[PDB]
Amino acid sequence: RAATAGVRISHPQRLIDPSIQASKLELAEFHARYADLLLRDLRERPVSLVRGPDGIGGELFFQKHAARLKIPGIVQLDPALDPGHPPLLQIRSAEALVGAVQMGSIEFHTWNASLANLERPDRFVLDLDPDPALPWKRMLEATQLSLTLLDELGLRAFLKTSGGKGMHLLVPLERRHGWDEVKDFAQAISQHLARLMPERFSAVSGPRNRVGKIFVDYLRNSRGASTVAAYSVRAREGLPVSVPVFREELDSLQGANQWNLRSLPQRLDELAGDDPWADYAGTRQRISAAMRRQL
Ligand SMILES: Nc1ncnc2c1ncn2[C@H]1C[C@H](O)[C@@H](COP(=O)(O)OP(=O)(O)OP(=O)(O)O)O1
Ligand SMILES: [Mn+2]
Ligand SMILES: [Mn+2]
- Atom of ligand 1 at shortest range from CA of 207: 14
Is 167 flagged in the annotation as binding? yes
Resolution rounded to one decimal, in angstroms? 1.9
Q: Which residues lie below 8 Å from residue 180, measured CB to CB, with a gap of 6+? A: none
Query: Is any ligand 1 atom within 6 A of the Cβ of residue 256?
Result: yes
Confirm or deny that 217 is annotated as ligand binding.
Answer: yes
What's 112-166 look like in SS3?
CCCCCCCCCCCEEEEEEEECCCCCHHHHHHHHHHHHHHHHHHCCCCEEEECCCCC
What is the whole-number distance in angstroms between the Cα of residue 13 and the centre of ligand 2?
31
Residue 269's contacts (CB-CB under 8 Å, 6 or more residues apart) are: none
Ligand 1 touching residue 165 (CB < 6 A): yes
Tell me, yes or no, whether 2 lies in a domain: no
Whether 235 maps to a domain, the answer reads yes
> In this structure, is residue 52 part of a structural domain?
yes
Hey, which residues does 125 pair with through a beta bridge?
A: 170
Measure Cα distances from 204 to 155, 208, 210 in Å: 23, 9, 8
5 within some domain:
no
CATH code, domain with 100: 3.90.920.10
Separation between Cα atoms, residue 122 and residue 170, nearest integer Å: 10
Spacing, Cα 125 to ligand 3 middle (Å): 10
9 neighbors 105 (Cβ within 8 angstroms): no
Q: Write down the experimental method used for this entry.
A: X-ray
3-state secondary structure of 235: coil
Residue whose CA lies nearest to ligand 1 atom number 3: 236
Q: Evaluate: CB of 257 within 6 angstroms of ligand 1.
A: no
**CA dist., res. 1 & res. 101, Å (int):** 14
Atom of ligand 1 nearest to the CA of 165: 27
Q: Is the CB of 127 under 6 A from ligand 1?
A: yes
Asked, for residue 4, whether it belongs to a domain, the answer is no
Instruction: Give whole-number Cα distances, 239 to 27, 55, 137, 233, 235, in Å.
Output: 9, 11, 23, 6, 6
**263 C-alpha to center of ligand 2: Å?**
22
Residue 29: inside a domain: yes
What's the CA-to-centroid distance between 2 and ligand 1, angstroms? 33
Atom of ligand 1 nearest to the CA of 242: 24
Name the residue at shortest CA distance from atom 10 of ligand 1. 164
Instruction: Say how far apart CA 292 and CA 52 lie, in whole Å.
Output: 42
Q: Are 87 and 118 in contact (CB under 8 A)?
A: no
Give the total number of structural domains in the chain: 1
CB of 162 sitting under 6 A from ligand 1:
yes
Largest Cα–Cα separation, the chain: 57
Asked if residue 154 belongs to a domain, the reply is yes
Question: How far is residue 171's CA from residue 157's CA, in Å, rounded to a whole number?
Answer: 5
**What distance in angstroms lies between residue 282's CA and the mean position of ligand 1's atoms?**
31
Cα–Cα distance for residue pair 88/67, rounded to 1 Å: 9
Task: Give which of 147, 116, 105 is closest to 235, Cα–Cα.
Answer: 105
Q: Which amino acid is at 192?
A: H
Neighbour-count burial of 145, counting CB atoms closer than 10 A to its CB (0-12 exposed, 13-18 middle, 19+ buried): middle
* Exposure letters 183-204 (e unless 16+ CB within 10 A, then b): bbbbbbbbbbbbeeeeebbbbe
State which ligand 1 atom lies nearest to the alpha carbon of 56.
1
Ligand 1 within 6 A of CB of 267: no
Q: Is 1 contained in some domain?
A: no
HSE-CB at 261 with a 13 A cutoff on CA atoms is 29
Query: Domain containing 249: what range?
Result: 14-295
* Pocket flag, ligand 1, residue 129 (CB < 6 Å): yes
Residue partners of 44: CB distance under 8 A and separation at least 6: 92, 114, 115, 116
Ligand 1 atom closest to the Cα of residue 163 is: 27
Ligand nearest to the CA of 109: 1
